Design a protein around this ligand. Structure first.
Ligand SMILES: Cc1ncc(C[n+]2csc(CCOP(=O)(O)OP(=O)(O)O)c2C)c(N)n1
Ligand SMILES: Cc1ncc(C[n+]2csc(CCOP(=O)(O)OP(=O)(O)O)c2C)c(N)n1
Ligand SMILES: [Mg+2]
Ligand SMILES: [Mg+2]
Lengths: 674, 678
């Protein structure tokens, strides 16, 4: 069968899927159909019967609004995604949401939609392939060998994160990363000349990429030749495919009218005429299904690879076992035993250190067990302390290491790490000052949405950092992480909580981990072995009164010592005071009602939350009858001890607030609470 | 004097200021001291006695951590920044914080520190100059004519926002923007080759910039030639100044050790010897002060510009009064009565339209009175509805307009706008989907920290946007804006609250405004004239009960209609229900205790907050005894009305929740009723 009929099946399913939904974006799927057909039928190595084949090529659709394109590709080639699924595009609980979502449909490699992050995830997956290949491939046994293909549009290229991702991808020499730019000259505002006029080829040459300019995106021969050139060049390749958006529509192609609205029934009939497509809505001839099917090619490719791996396993049994364990996301053999012993050693051996130093100590203790670590920092290795004795930097000519110098690229680093975690085989971690979490904010939201592991070491977490001032001092950042669905946010109060937070983060594979560490030194607290085990519950009783407490101090991270010292002075003045350490509110929230009531009994309304962060978050735990000692403003440039005093993080202020609060409990005004 | 000696006065003050503080970054100041001396003493047009002079050149230190460089320049050239101020570097309440802060120290044009935003601010500043020139300059009367100079380091160039700002600046032909890149081969991790290897001149060439590569940043003649070439070229110019970081220090120069730590007393003495600087800590000889002073040149330059403006005013009195009005940040003559008439007309003439359309209607109605408007959208003009009939796009060849197509550049747009607001002459607004506020988040924070106007039209504010799904559907974003100090976040519930929010945002010149607009139609609510006036208080009684309420429904934005309907049903079943509209919690928080108690009385604890956003924010207003009807998950891709029903935003659920809540609260009251204590 002729090629153009096969490409035209993509266009028909796309425009029909969008029309039945009366919602969605037919432009880009129709403009890129030829490129997709050449790539998918001619070059992509994948098995539709096993979307998790470890050595499959990875395809990412970074211009994610053209979701019908990838849904069309998955259905046509034989994945478990049916015509009825396409008929349910953008409908309640379907496998075909309006933007493609990881784990919603088989073969979707990442969730896209926020522009720029698809290409950045793809840079990550290319880095994972290259590192796995450098760590596992042996002479005559190259068991890691697959490419990363990305489609992107003008929106992705305008976004700043494309500059971070692709600059670093050049430095690191990611020759198996192959990106197709949908150069169609249009974005939502219309003709892009007024706002997007880069020499895009020259830009990517400046990144050290291999760039193939001026490729006719509707010539199957030019597309095939560009892909062949790309696979042969050892630098990442940008293929600049010039296309017509909405290709096939007589009246709406080359216009922003076809970008993100249904074509309409009249225009759709005219498009079928123009393309010579004589089949109605969702009708694919069996001949097309035959020529598009990838099931037997893919079954043969995986069977071959399974034999390739069996040979590898005979010759390198220990390495093969490591490869199996890591690509399945399994922990090391004695993980639980060894990790818990490390934690108990820390509780036995108090150090008063900064929790960022405790973080480095946990990396050193746990990392000896975790060859799958792939750490890094956005140019802050000596302040975040993300390197330990075993850290080895990745470089273009040697990807066998385990540490990435991301440069000043918080957003790119965080979304690269999503691509690494999605790829499999590693436990990635990254780092920056907690303030500059904000530069990478949406990539962390995307990890929560995708339910992938993404461990962020966020140091310098409050006014405790001191002189660098209010552009650096977090105030509201911790709360904005706590308010994010499926974010796990840990603010350890000492080296023991720090190591527990790291152990849980390493184990946390269904969502991101924000590990919040202090610049300044933190006093270690005494804990029974039950209390150590209760750290993992996110909120636990650290100090208790004899008998029911009349006052509960809830504190996090660096403010716990302040709570403990104020509770000591109040106890010596006759008061019954409990101190609750709350390293992770999200873990505390998931504990059963019985546990939570045991920690914060509802009948004790005299509670004070103490945290060098935005106060308004804490009404959740103290309500109207409690008090909050926190921040309500930006910080100031000064030494930290002066900042803590100025902003009220003093034992005297906690004690006075407590006595004032206890006085409001007179005249039965507290006992009346129910 | 020898040129090098005047530059070394910068190096001396910088390293001495860092040493006294035992904190800060001496490397970059010492690296760029020669570039700074040539620029400031040989080209910068400024008046130390009036840092507010309208036609002064703008200087921006984008590598903000080298703050002792700009503090040295300000003190050396004659600004009101004393030796004692420099001796208080990084100390509590000083004029010299660890990163430079606009608003206190004279001469600080923006707050920097977060890498990449300074250069982006400068793009906006150059955009403001070029537009103010196009709108006001006449033949023989060019009253607007200044340059925008920026120093920036490798960190700013690695950051993605530099791509957004400089790509657009190329497209717009900002020829009076002149950026110096501190090309010293070093960042915090060390030698940058393992993580930063762009062909940076070629990169900027690709942006349509004028690039001057390989300038010796310690050669005054080369630096000077580069600047002259820059000012002659009509494209924005990148001057690639190679420097040695910490230049002068024998043992720490060219190394990341001098980046962000004090040099040490012994290294400083060796550095003094190496530089031939024979003066003690903070000691500046008199002939250095005399050679550095810009006071006389600066007073002459401004005096000359004042005469140019007197000539302009004589020739063009109406344009001149407009220039003075806009440069002084004043609103048009009849703003208050005309804007209030627009708002009263909307209350009188109900329309059920999406608040994003009401946003467009406010732009149209208010924009006719505001030639200072400078709007835009990050490639979403037809969805955000940011263009009205008077919108005219800026073009490289025609900057007389009032609208910017920012492209898909949320972070760059937002930080450019801070630059526009800092420059003066405009009321800027930008726009994107509320979700992609997250891309621009820290530029919104910087606006709030700096207390500058920055109006953002954030549309498609909830699961109400429907099928695009959870990558687009905001859940926790409104609450993140509400927790930011000096953020004003407005979620209007109909076209009347929408126009009030726009009126107050246009007036809000000391902080950013986040205006949260719906995709879908919103029912207009009825209001007395007093209720219309109380919209501006951020929270007010929309529907009161007959007698003291036993239940309060608190709602925002698209969920106010839901609360009104639920109250109607509850009132029909005999309950006493109050509906509070809370378009802006931050404005409500600032009302006095009497007003807040009148809206939310402490006696009435049966409260329900209703909002298609993250639930846990609302504990501030409902406490432990209320309920919250909101989101606790990401959204899902489906039609909007099925999402609202699935996530509990129905009259049935609100009514059922209220009835349970009241039965519970009446039960607990009953256990207490016969007790004798208060
Ligand atoms: C970060 C981000 N900002 C904004 C949007 C909104 N948006 C979706 S598609 C699009 C237009 C970009 O056009 P292009 O990538 O050229 O695609 P085409 O219309 O050619 O298919 C925009 C602004 C988004 N999805 N993500
Ligand atoms: C957005 C952001 N990310 C990280 C930082 C932390 N930081 C401050 S200075 C710096 C080093 C950047 O190096 P460069 O700009 O080359 O400065 P130089 O040391 O040469 O003066 C870093 C990572 C920051 N200030 N802002
Ligand atoms: Mg396009
Ligand atoms: Mg540098």
């Amino acid at each position: 069968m002729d090629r153009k009929h096969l490409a035209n099946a993509i266009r028909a399913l796309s425009m029909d899927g969008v029309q039945k939904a009366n919602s969605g974006h037919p432009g880009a799927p129709m403009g890129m159909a030829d490129i997709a057909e050449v790539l998918w039928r001619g070059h992509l190595n994948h098995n539709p019967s096993n979307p998790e084949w470890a050595d499959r090529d990875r395809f990412v659709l970074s211009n994610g609004h053209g979701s019908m394109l990838i849904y069309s590709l998955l259905h046509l080639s034989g994945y478990e995604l049916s015509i009825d699924d396409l008929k349910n595009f953008r409908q309640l609980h379907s496998k075909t949401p309006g933007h493609p979502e990881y784990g919603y449909a088989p073969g979707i490699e990442t969730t896209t939609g926020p522009l720029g992050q698809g290409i950045t995830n793809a840079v990550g997956m290319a880095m994972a392939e290259k590192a796995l290949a450098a760590q596992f491939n042996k002479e005559g046994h190259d068991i890691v060998d697959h490419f990363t293909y990305v489609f992107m549009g003008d929106g992705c290229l305008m976004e700043g994160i494309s500059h971070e991702a692709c600059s670093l991808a050049g430095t690191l020499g990611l020759g198996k990363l192959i990106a197709f730019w949908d150069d169609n000259g249009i974005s939502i505002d219309g003709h892009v000349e007024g706002w997007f006029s880069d020499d895009t080829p020259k830009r990517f040459e400046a990144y050290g990429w291999h760039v193939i300019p001026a490729v006719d995106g509707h010539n199957a021969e030019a597309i095939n030749a560009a892909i062949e050139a790309a696979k042969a060049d050892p630098r990442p390749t940008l293929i600049c495919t010039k296309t017509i958006i909405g290709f096939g529509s007589p009246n709406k192609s080359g216009s922003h009218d076809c970008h993100g609205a249904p074509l309409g029934a009249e225009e759709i009939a005219a498009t079928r005429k123009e393309l010579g497509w004589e089949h109605g809505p969702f009708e694919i001839p069996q001949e097309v299904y035959a020529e598009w099917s990838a099931k037997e090619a893919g079954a043969a490719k995986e069977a071959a690879w399974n034999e390739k791996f069996a040979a590898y396993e005979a010759a390198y049994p220990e390495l093969a076992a490591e490869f199996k364990r890591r690509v399945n996301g399994e922990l090391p053999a004695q993980w639980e035993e060894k990790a818990n012993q490390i934690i108990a050693d820390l509780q036995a051996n108090p150090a008063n250190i900064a929790s960022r130093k405790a973080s480095q100590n946990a990396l050193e203790a746990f990392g000896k067990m975790l060859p799958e670590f792939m750490g890094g920092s956005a140019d802050l290795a000596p302040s975040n302390l993300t390197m330990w004795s075993g850290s080895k930097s990745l470089e273009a000519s040697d990807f066998s290491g385990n540490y990435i110098h991301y440069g000043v690229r918080e957003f790119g680093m965080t979304a690269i790490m999503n691509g690494i975690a999605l790829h499999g085989g590693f436990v990635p971690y990254g780092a920056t000052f907690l303030m500059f979490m904000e530069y990478a904010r949406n990539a962390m939201r995307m990890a929560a949405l995708m339910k992938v592991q993404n461990i962020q070491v966020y140091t310098h977490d409050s006014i405790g950092l001191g002189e660098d001032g209010p552009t650096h001092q977090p105030v509201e950042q911790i709360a904005s992480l706590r308010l994010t669905p499926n974010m796990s946010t840990w603010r350890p109060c000492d080296q023991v909580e720090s190591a527990v937070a790291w152990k849980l983060a390493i184990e946390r594979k269904d969502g991101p981990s924000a590990l919040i560490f202090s610049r300044q030194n933190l006093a270690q607290q005494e804990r029974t072995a039950e209390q150590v085990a209760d750290i993992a519950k996110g909120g636990y009783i650290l100090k208790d009164s004899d008998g029911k407490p009349e006052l509960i101090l809830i504190a996090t991270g660096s403010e716990v010592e302040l709570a403990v010292k104020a509770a000591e002075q109040l106890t010596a003045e006759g008061k019954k005071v409990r101190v609750v350490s709350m390293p992770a509110t999200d873990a505390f929230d998931k504990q059963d009602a019985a546990y939570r009531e045991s920690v914060l009994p509802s009948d004790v309304t005299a509670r004070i939350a103490i945290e060098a962060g935005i106060t308004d978050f804490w009404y959740k735990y103290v309500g109207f009858d409690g008090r909050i000692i926190g921040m309500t403003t930006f910080g100031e440039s000064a030494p930290a001890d002066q900042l803590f005093e100025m902003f009220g993080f003093t034992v005297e202020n906690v004690v006075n607030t407590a006595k004032e609060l206890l006085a409001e409990n007179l005249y039965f005004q507290g006992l009346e609470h129910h």
